[PDB]
C-alpha cells in the first residue's frame, strides 16, 4: 500500500490580542505524529504517535529549532501579506501551508507537494517539476519573485526528493506494525422503523484504519446511489475511524438490500444484509 | 522531519 508524509501549517494573525499563532502538525498517512503550537506552555515539538518516541533528544531539539524559526518567519510573512493586500490591522488573517512526499505501494517516490493559502484561498503552489511556482493573484507574484531570487524551489526539491523520502522510510519501519498493517472495519447492520411500514437500514463501519472506505447499498443487484444518507468519515478518537450508510426501505422488504464494504484491511470486499 | 527554511523563505 501507498504511504505519504504531510506537514500542515497554520499561521493566524490576531491583532488586539497580540502576536500571531503558529501551529504545525505532521502526519504519516492518517496518523498524526508531531505537533507544535506557539501558544503552548514551553514551545517545543511534542510526540503524537508511539513509534516516534524512540527518536533521541537531538531529534526534538532540531524540530523545536526549525519550528521556532518558522514562528518568526510566518509572523513576518503575515506582515508582508498585510502589506501586499494593503490590509489594516483591524482583521485576523491566516496563512496555511501543506507539503510532503507520497510513496507508491512499492516504496518509490510518486511525487512531492508544496501548497500555501491566504484567508482560505489558494495563494502559491510548487509545480510538478519542482523548479517553478504557480501564483494565484498578483500579491503572490511578489512572493514568486522573492522565492526565485533566493532559489527556494531548490531547498524544497532537496527536501521532497531527499529528506522527505528518507525520513518517511525511517518512520514507516520504526512503526511498521501500526503504519503498514491496516485495521479492517467492524461491520454490522441495524434495523430501525421510522414509520408504520417503511424502515431504516443503517450499515455501520467502526474501528478501521486508514480512513479510506467505501460503503454502498444495493437492491436486487443495483446500487442505491440516490436514496442513501452517507455521513462523512469521522475519527473515533483512538487512531481509528467511523462511517455509516443508511437507506429507507419498505417494511417486509429488508432482505432485498445489501451493504457493500471496501477497505484496505479487508482481504476481500464484504457483503452484508440485515440479520433478523 | 520538517522542511528547513529560515529567512528568504518569507512570503
Amino acid at each position, epitope marked *: 500500500g501507498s504511504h505519504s508524509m504531510r506537514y500542515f501549517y497554520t499561521a493566524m494573525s490576531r491583532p488586539g490580542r497580540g502576536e500571531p499563532r503558529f501551529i504545525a502538525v505532521g502526519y504519516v498517512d492518517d496518523t498524526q505524529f508531531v505537533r507544535f503550537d506557539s501558544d503552548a506552555a514551553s514551545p517545543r515539538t511534542e510526540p503524537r504517535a508511539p513509534w516516534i518516541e524512540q527518536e533521541g533528544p537531538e531529534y526534538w531539539d532540531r524540530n523545536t529549532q526549525i519550528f521556532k524559526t518558522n514562528t518568526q518567519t510566518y509572523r513576518e510573512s503575515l506582515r508582508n501579506l498585510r502589506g501586499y493586500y494593503n490590509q489594516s490591522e483591524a482583521g485576523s488573517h491566516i496563512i496555511q501551508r501543506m507539503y510532503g512526499c507520497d510513496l507508491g505501494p512499492d516504496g518509490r517516490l510518486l511525487r512531492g507537494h508544496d501548497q500555501s493559502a491566504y484567508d482560505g484561498k489558494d495563494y502559491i503552489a510548487l509545480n510538478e517539476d519542482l523548479s517553478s511556482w504557480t501564483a494565484a493573484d498578483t500579491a503572490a507574484q511578489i512572493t514568486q519573485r522573492k522565492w526565485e531570487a533566493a532559489r527556494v524551489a531548490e531547498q524544497l526539491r532537496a527536501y521532497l526528493e531527499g529528506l522527505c523520502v528518507e525520513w518517511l522510510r525511517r518512520y514507516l519501519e520504526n512503526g511498521k506494525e501500526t503504519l503498514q498493517r491496516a485495521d479492517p472495519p467492524k461491520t454490522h447492520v441495524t434495523h430501525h422503523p421510522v414509520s408504520d411500514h417503511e424502515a431504516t437500514l443503517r450499515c455501520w463501519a467502526l474501528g478501521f484504519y486508514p480512513a479510506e472506505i467505501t460503503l454502498t447499498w444495493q437492491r436486487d443487484g443495483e446500487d442505491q446511489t440516490q436514496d442513501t444518507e452517507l455521513v462523512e468519515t469521522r475519527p473515533a478518537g483512538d487512531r481509528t475511524f467511523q462511517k455509516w450508510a443508511a437507506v429507507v426501505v419498505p417494511s417486509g422488504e429488508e432482505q432485498r438490500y445489501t451493504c457493500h464494504v471496501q477497505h484496505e484491511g479487508l482481504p476481500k470486499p464484504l457483503t452484508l444484509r440485515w440479520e433478523p | 522531519e520538517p522542511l528547513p*527554511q*529560515g529567512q528568504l523563505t518569507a512570503y
Partner: T-cell receptor, first 114, second 110 residues
C-alpha cells in the same frame, strides 16, 4: 568585511583570565556562528545562534560561552582561558537557508599563555 | 558526519587538479565548497545538492548522492589558486549546520 566585524583582531592573555570576542554584523542575518581553526583540524563549531537569545552547542563547546542579546552582536566568552583555547577564531553569519553560503568574518588570532 | 578530504595536493600552473571529498551522510541536505587563503576568511565557491557536474568558470563541482562523493575540479591552474579548499556538509545528524572537513592544502608550483 562583508558587514562582519571582529574585535579584538589580535589578543594575548594570561591563562585563567576572562576573554571575550565580538562578532558584529550589519545585514540582519538570523544565524550567527563561532568556529575555531586549529592545525590538523579544519574549522570546528563552538556555538551557534538561531536568533536573539537562541543558542546551541557545537562540537567544541567546553570552556566556551555565548550570548546573543541582540541581532547585531554574537559574543564569545572564555570564562577561564586555558592554553588549549589558543587558536584562530572565525565568526560567520547566514540567512539560515540550506542553499545559501555562510559569510565569514576576518578572523581573530588569540594566544593564551601561562 | 565524517567529512574526508586529502591533506595536501601539488600541481603546476596551467594544469588540472581534482580535490576529492567523501562524506558518510544520511540526512544529507547539501554540500558546500569554500576557498580559504592562509591568513584569510573562507569565501563561497559552490553549493551542491543535486547529482551532476556544475561549471562556474574554471571551477567545476561534482556530486554523487548515492555514494557520498564530491570533487572540486580546478582547471587552467593559476598561482592565485594556491590556497586551502574546504568541504562542508549539512546533515540532519547534527543540524543542517555546515560542518567542515579538515580542508585540503593546494600548492600551485610555478
Amino acid at each position: 568585511d562583508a558587514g562582519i566585524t571582529q574585535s579584538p583582531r589580535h589578543k594575548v592573555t594570561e591563562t585563567g583570565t576572562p576573554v571575550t570576542l565580538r562578532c558584529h554584523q550589519t545585514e540582519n542575518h538570523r544565524y550567527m556562528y563561532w568556529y575555531r581553526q586549529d592545525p590538523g583540524h579544519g574549522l570546528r563549531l563552538i556555538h551557534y545562534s538561531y536568533g536573539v537569545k537562541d543558542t546551541d552547542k557545537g562540537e567544541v563547546s567546553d570552556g566556551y560561552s555565548v550570548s546573543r542579546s541582540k541581532t547585531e552582536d554574537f559574543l564569545l566568552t572564555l570564562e577561564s582561558a586555558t592554553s588549549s583555547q589558543t587558536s584562530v577564531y572565525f565568526c560567520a553569519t547566514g540567512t539560515g537557508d540550506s542553499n545559501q553560503p555562510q559569510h565569514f568574518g576576518d578572523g581573530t588570532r588569540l594566544s593564551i599563555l601561562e | 558526519q565524517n567529512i574526508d578530504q586529502p591533506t595536501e595536493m601539488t600541481a603546476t600552473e596551467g594544469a588540472i587538479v581534482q580535490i576529492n571529498c567523501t562524506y558518510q551522510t544520511s540526512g544529507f541536505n547539501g554540500l558546500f565548497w569554500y576557498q580559504q587563503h592562509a591568513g584569510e576568511a573562507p569565501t563561497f565557491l559552490s553549493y551542491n545538492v543535486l547529482d551532476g557536474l556544475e561549471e562556474k568558470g574554471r571551477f567545476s563541482s561534482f556530486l554523487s548522492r548515492s555514494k557520498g562523493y564530491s570533487y572540486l575540479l580546478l582547471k587552467e591552474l593559476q598561482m592565485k589558486d594556491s590556497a586551502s579548499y574546504l568541504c562542508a556538509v549539512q546533515a540532519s545528524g547534527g543540524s543542517y549546520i555546515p560542518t567542515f572537513g579538515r580542508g585540503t592544502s593546494l600548492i600551485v608550483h610555478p
